[PDB]
Structure 1
Amino acid sequence: LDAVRKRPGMYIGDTDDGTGLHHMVFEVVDNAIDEALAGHCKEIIVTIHADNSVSVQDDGRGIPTGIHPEEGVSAAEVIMTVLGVGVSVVNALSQKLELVIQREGKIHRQIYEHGVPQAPLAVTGETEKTGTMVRFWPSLETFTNVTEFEYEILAKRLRELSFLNSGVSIRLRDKRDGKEDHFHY
């Protein structure tokens, strides 16, 4: 991931004018859409939190949790840490990232800081539901000037995606001012 950390702008886009900041959300949403497509309910929830983080949930199968035979770590960790530009870019440029996977009757959790896992992916409980959730806090060392998520930039792109991905429900929620939308074709 140091190649991404060296030149963030080349992977995510301009880190000063707000282009890169919002692309972080869109990269995560692309992965959530693929997961939503192969599930049953087919819904995604993008939430802007009051502390300037964004969470993207899907209700799909849950991304794979088993150990990757080559890398020797969880398959999820390989997705989050190894080089669509990839969510590993988003992880590398996030001062914190929380991963939650609901799969095969179990809830799995992992925390990253600047792309570095704080511990191995771990089973934290039981559940009937399935899906994946990523909440990330953009690194304020990387992202300058425009540091706050504008609602309408996200709403605009998610609207475009809802037409292209006709089977998927996309909800957008802003916890700062209570604004919300529901894009579905």
Structure 2
Amino acid sequence: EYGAASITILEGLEAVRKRPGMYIGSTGERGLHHLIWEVVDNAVDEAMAGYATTVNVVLLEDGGVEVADDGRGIPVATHASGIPTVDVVMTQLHAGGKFDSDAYAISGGLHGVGVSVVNALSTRLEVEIKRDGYEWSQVYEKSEPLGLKQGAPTKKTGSTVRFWADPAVFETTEYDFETVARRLQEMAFLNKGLTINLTDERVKVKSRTFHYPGGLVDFVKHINRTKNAIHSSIVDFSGKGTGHEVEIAMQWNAGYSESVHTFANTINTHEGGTHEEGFRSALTSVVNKYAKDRKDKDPNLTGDDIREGLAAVISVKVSEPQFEGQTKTKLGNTEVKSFVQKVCNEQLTHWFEANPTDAKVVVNKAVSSAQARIAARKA
């Protein structure tokens, strides 16, 4: 019979180990790599806040991942739930300091689930925290804490998370260096002044330094390095509104491909959302309202043909975000659709006028790319 005894309540991390796909999105390489993002995105939130200026990540030999920061560190002192804050953050879901714009103003994190999930789907988790004028060591064996130990009193501040992914959870436990390198480089572009270092101590040692003072501009310079830029200038505009900011940097390449990267609080919203679509709505209307004003191909230009051969970065800095899942693939802030739309619309028009040479080259590009579609459609 189906009744009272059939229904069961899972105790937090039990839910993560049972259904990892809800928090990690998959048990495959994508989900494996997601444990690094939870830990690094957390460290980078401290740099978004400004308390950290350096984040070092290590792909350890054994299988571990070491992520350090010169931030404030994970609160150590006794939490209101009894157990010290470190343990709360590491073992309990919806236990975070990103539920308000107090501790962290603009942050990638928001659910209070990230590093707790890492702790769940990890065999071991070690944390080093230099805070409250002292160093701290706490070890998590199979998610369970071994006890909080206090070390040497240091003036320096920050946290160092280390984690060994559970192979019983994950098919592959070996990370991809280029996947890590790529993502960390983006976080460096999206956070001017920040330095990310990645070393691969796997069996000489592979290491990268990621510091881009040119921010989003160097990001496009990077995307259009291999593939010839059609124009010299790089559109670089930044709008700021009520609990949301937006920096947009873009340039068109001589290729026939879309290279439009979208971010929200550094976090890679690679399914876009209401910041991508807000940028898309403005870019389609601006280029069309410029093409119509200048010079013709009677139907309207598609966004997909306007964006064909475009390297574009859309980075939004929102106070109260609305992310798709723990994965954070899509942005849902309805308000941010119209916020990016307006900033994008006024500033895009302002670039077109100011740069008539580049404008002519990119609109002719949108026309020739559109004419090619109708031409192919005829077959």
| TM-score, scaled relative to structure 1 | 0.92
For 1:66 and 1:44, locate their aligned partners in 2 and report how far apart those are by CA, in whole Å.
Answer: 24
- Aligned-pair CA distance for 1:113: 1.8
Matched, 1:76 2:104: no
Deviations 1:113-155 (A, max 9, x none): 2211122x221222232110000000011011x2201100001
The residue type paired with residue 157 of structure 1 is: R
Over 3 Å counting, the alpha-carbon distance change for 1:112 and 1:164 in structure 2 is same
Question: Retained in 2: the 8 A contact 1:37–1:167?
Answer: no
Question: Retained in 1: the 8 A contact 2:74–2:129?
Answer: yes
Alignment of 1:4-43 (within 5 A): 4-16=16-28, 18-39=29-50, 42-43=53-54
Number of the residue aligned with 1:47: 58
The residue type paired with residue 58 of structure 1 is: D
The residue type paired with residue 103 of structure 1 is: R
Aligned with residue 171 of structure 1, among 197, 203, 209: 197
Look up the SS of the partner of 2:129 in the other structure: strand
For 1:39 and 1:161, locate their aligned partners in 2 and report how far apart those are by CA, in whole Å.
Answer: 14
Matched, 1:128 2:155: yes
Question: Retained in 1: the 8 A contact 2:166–2:173?
Answer: no
- Aligned-pair CA distance for 1:40: 5.3
- Unmatched runs of 5 consecutive residues or more in structure 1: none
Matched, 1:138 2:149: no
Ranked by relative contact order (alpha carbons within 8 Å, sequence separation 6 or more), the top structure is 1
Look up the SS of the partner of 1:28 in the other structure: helix
Aligned with residue 126 of structure 2, among 79, 95, 98: 98
Number of the residue aligned with 1:61: 72
For 1:127 and 1:10, locate their aligned partners in 2 and report how far apart those are by CA, in whole Å.
Answer: 39
Aligned length: 181
Matched, 1:112 2:112: no
- Aligned-pair CA distance for 1:89: 0.4
Number of the residue aligned with 1:182: 209
- Aligned-pair CA distance for 1:36: 3.1
- Report the identity percentage: 52
For 1:23 and 1:159, locate their aligned partners in 2 and report how far apart those are by CA, in whole Å.
Answer: 16
- Aligned-pair CA distance for 1:24: 0.2
Question: Retained in 2: the 8 A contact 1:97–1:111?
Answer: yes
For 1:5 and 1:76, locate their aligned partners in 2 and report how far apart those are by CA, in whole Å.
Answer: 20
Question: Retained in 2: the 8 A contact 1:38–1:61?
Answer: no
- Unmatched runs of 5 consecutive residues or more in structure 2: 1-12, 94-108, 213-379
Over 3 Å counting, the alpha-carbon distance change for 1:63 and 1:172 in structure 2 is same
Alignment of 1:142-153 (within 5 A): 142-144=169-171, 146-153=172-179
Larger Rg: 2
For 2:48 and 2:160, locate their aligned partners in 1 and report how far apart those are by CA, in whole Å.
Answer: 15
Question: Retained in 2: the 8 A contact 1:101–1:109?
Answer: yes
Over 3 Å counting, the alpha-carbon distance change for 1:152 and 1:74 in structure 2 is same
Question: Retained in 2: the 8 A contact 1:100–1:110?
Answer: yes
For 1:7 and 1:157, locate their aligned partners in 2 and report how far apart those are by CA, in whole Å.
Answer: 25
For 2:182 and 2:137, locate their aligned partners in 1 and report how far apart those are by CA, in whole Å.
Answer: 31
For 2:51 and 2:166, locate their aligned partners in 1 and report how far apart those are by CA, in whole Å.
Answer: 34
| TM-score, scaled relative to structure 2 | 0.46
